[PDB]
Ligand binder design. Sequence first.
Ligand SMILES: CCNC1=N[C@@H]2[C@@H](O)[C@H](O)[C@@H](CO)O[C@@H]2S1
Ligand SMILES: CCNC1=N[C@@H]2[C@@H](O)[C@H](O)[C@@H](CO)O[C@@H]2S1
Lengths: 444, 443
Amino acid sequence: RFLCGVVEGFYGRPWVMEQRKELFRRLQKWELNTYLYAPKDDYKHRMFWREMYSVEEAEQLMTLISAAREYEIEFIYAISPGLDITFSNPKEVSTLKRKLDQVSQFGCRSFALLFDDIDHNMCAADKEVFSSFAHAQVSITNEIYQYLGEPETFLFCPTEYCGTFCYPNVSQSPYLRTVGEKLLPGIEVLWTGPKVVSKEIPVESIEEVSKIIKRAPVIWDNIHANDYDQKRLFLGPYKGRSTELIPRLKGVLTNPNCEFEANYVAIHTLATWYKSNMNGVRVLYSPQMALKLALTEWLQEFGVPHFVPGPNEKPLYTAEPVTLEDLQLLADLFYLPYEHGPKGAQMLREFQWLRANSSVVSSEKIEEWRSRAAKFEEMCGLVMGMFTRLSNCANRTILYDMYSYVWDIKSIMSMVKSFVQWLGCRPWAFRGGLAGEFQRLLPI
Amino acid sequence: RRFLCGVVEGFYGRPWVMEQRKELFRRLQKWELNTYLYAPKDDYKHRMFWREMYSVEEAEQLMTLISAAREYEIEFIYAISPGLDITFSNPKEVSTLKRKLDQVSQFGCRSFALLFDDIDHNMCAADKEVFSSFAHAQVSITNEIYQYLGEPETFLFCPTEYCGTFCYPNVSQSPYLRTVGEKLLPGIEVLWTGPKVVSKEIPVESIEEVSKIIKRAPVIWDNIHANDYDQKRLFLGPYKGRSTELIPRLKGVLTNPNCEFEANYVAIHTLATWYKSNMNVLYSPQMALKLALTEWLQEFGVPHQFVPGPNEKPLYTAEPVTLEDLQLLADLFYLPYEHGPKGAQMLREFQWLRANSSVVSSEKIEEWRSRAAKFEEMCGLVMGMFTRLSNCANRTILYDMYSYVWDIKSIMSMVKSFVQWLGCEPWAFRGGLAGEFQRLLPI
Ligand SMILES: CCNC1=N[C@@H]2[C@@H](O)[C@H](O)[C@@H](CO)O[C@@H]2S1
Ligand SMILES: CCNC1=N[C@@H]2[C@@H](O)[C@H](O)[C@@H](CO)O[C@@H]2S1
């Protein structure tokens, strides 16, 4: 009984119903099993958590939940009341009960209460009834859990949800100690690893948290999340999680990129990772092999919607389709939060070398520069080629989700190329807007 | 009479959907503008697959869209962009273009355009035997298409050399433009973006200069509020840097605004205020921004009752977006060559704070502490603005702006945090690989 799949848990434009239903189809195809509904900015999930769904909204959520059932995917409805719930007010607890029972009437059997990303200070009234913030959360989570009939899946997201958020540390946290003692054993707890966006989730870090919350956690993995940096996108493989974690966890739910169609690799490789050690206890997964397996499959989606010129006539612009090597390049340029893929790292390293040795144009090492320059111009050329062929693909829906990222990298790479050519001889200047001018003044 | 003023959907990336286009027509009418130019770079049958006829499904949507334009008294101009691919000398290829344009004509469209922007200047062998230059080639098919369609009242041509800096060797001596102005039939209008692609100013003398070589007044395709070229940028400042004296020297101004549809309230509203002011001293950009923002504000409380006690947790969602929030947001996402006053002021204060920061380690310590606290308050107003936007009832507007407002709030919080650090790990490597290449360019 392992919860593996996807949480729609990010800030910004949520996914629409058509996209969520298409997620369920992909999760089933790849032998995953769970979806957690938690879009930070879907209004009736968090900001207006008190408000019941309209008849129109009710119909859409019913339809969505029946679609999950049809694709053998567990639907878990989360609610986020912590910005403004008065925990001690039984009217307020009733309002929360009312909302979750409305969703229960749509056919949903699994639920979650989330208390992430709220400040830890209670109102006067709650400080008279509860001795700490943790007691307050645990009290209503426990009451809600039993009101719903102790459902087989019920998740709790702590305020201290990762190593670095734990005061003073994970193993001595008064907040976590109270959760692990008082939260009913049937309830699962969400955790993101040592950090919000964890480079690695070591097994010993999970032993440490497990003994204080007194269960194995479900991981809410933010490895492929991109709601925090407007320029970033993550198409690298699931990585930095040993397959030995699987027996030490209740699940992994990935919180992937905002742009729905960018999550093919993110979700596909997660499925490859889970499947590789589905039945372990106490070298099964290769990230690089999994990326390749995912990109080969993704490629087939690009040629699917969602005159022959003479010897001396202008040839078709549109003739060349996207190739596996284009997607390999794109993925290496938009790889992972703490690492670029091999080609990106290599281009970056070559450009730094070229620039730092550029004064040698002005005798032996000139042929080193010219040859390295030309090899670098070719690589920039492949980035423009990749953009050009993407731009011409039949799957417009995929193109539109990626577009502004692919344009950006192509655009910058063309400008870098142009600069290396300029080294070999000797309109949009405030790049990044106001935000960018403040960044340039910070340390790096 | 007969000045084309309105909006061109002419940008790179996700086009607008039909629901948004129809809502544009309603806004253009409200504000007394009159024209829409359909030219979305990446709508596949506009440019890349310009040869392909619309499907039955696609045809029905365009018919519906064109009827909606007619209902809102907006002229619908269909553009097509064949220049990536077209063999100009091949009459099969000319016929294919004719076929597509008469398909659109059958949807009820009476106005058209051929665009040759952003294509390389080199012809194929076969075209170089028939035409002596690139301009002759374009002008030949534009002329043939124009007369096949019965010399329609509105027909636009977009030149390859569409701005001062694109003209070889300069605007007044260009062999490309000379040929256009001589040979392009007089009934045809020509598009122009000013001295540059994104022009800070469009001076009157620059328009006299281009007018005498193309031998007409141009229609301006204005990119002042375009944002398809920098993913961090958004433009909510007012229409600015074009004298009202241009209006009698032009056939029109079509603005090519931000990709995010709901961000173009100010862009289009102030353009309308500018055109109306000298339709036949008159226009203040700052006054127009204010007029536009006060109208936009009313949209935020419209979709597209617990009362907490004295000592209970107050509602998070209680405070609505204010005019002063939108004034701040606009100044943070103002214009391509200028930030609005508040942004410039915050930037200037932060630079001063950082450059004098060694004074915490006697007289001008109180200058720093006082200036620091005044700066922390301003960063606080940015977070307030984000927070209230995040709670607004018009979710459609929120989602278009979201990632920009999150970004500025996020950076401003980090700057604040840094000023506090000057007194008493997950997203430091900001901007990915693109950003690391930028940091190495000269700036
Ligand atoms: C335990 C889950 N709580 C969290 N809340 C946030 C999510 O909404 C974001 O998408 C994620 C990445 O930016 O960062 C934190 S992780
Ligand atoms: C009127 C000449 N054509 C032009 N083609 C491009 C447009 O598609 C872009 O939106 C604009 C701003 O990036 O830059 C040029 S202007």
